Design a protein around this ligand. Sequence first.
Ligand code: HEM
Length: 153
Amino acid sequence: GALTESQAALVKSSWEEFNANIPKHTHRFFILVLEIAPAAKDLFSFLKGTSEVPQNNPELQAHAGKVFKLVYEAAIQLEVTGVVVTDATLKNLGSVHVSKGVADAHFPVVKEAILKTIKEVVGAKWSEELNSAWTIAYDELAIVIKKEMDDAA
Ligand code: HEM
């Protein structure tokens, strides 16, 4: 629905449920990233050097917390305004990803890990409409971040 108010409402409620247990869901998210692309471990300071994904690391928690909140806020923004607006936070973001060695081809990795995270968080409440809602917000945000990366470089 390239975000109907009911699509927006679902992203908000699944985000709230996400954010109710940051320790568990952010740990789950990084397991899912490494299962999809084990080589991505090396990109994160808080991981590189560990055996298993840490369970009580505040840097891991703060980073995965920010990533999910920005997709959520992009979903509201698309629904309200019809676009994802660039800003200071997203151009700064463009600059940190270039520094960290994040490339365009990494985006599908974090997309699949997010969809799989959200499916586990909501359990039986999962729907095709929820999945298509997170998908659209992620893709539209990703477009705008990829631009800034292009531009940061
Ligand atoms: C829509 C998708 C994405 C969002 C909203 C996002 C958001 C962010 C944010 C908000 C930060 C923190 C910036 C700061 O305060 O310095 C961050 C850092 C970072 N992100 Fe992204 N990200 C996305 C995609 C990805 C992807 C695909 C990767 C790579 C697999 C990635 C890897 C990183 C790394 C390595 C850092 C630095 C974290 C650190 O060690 O502090 N991100 N991202």
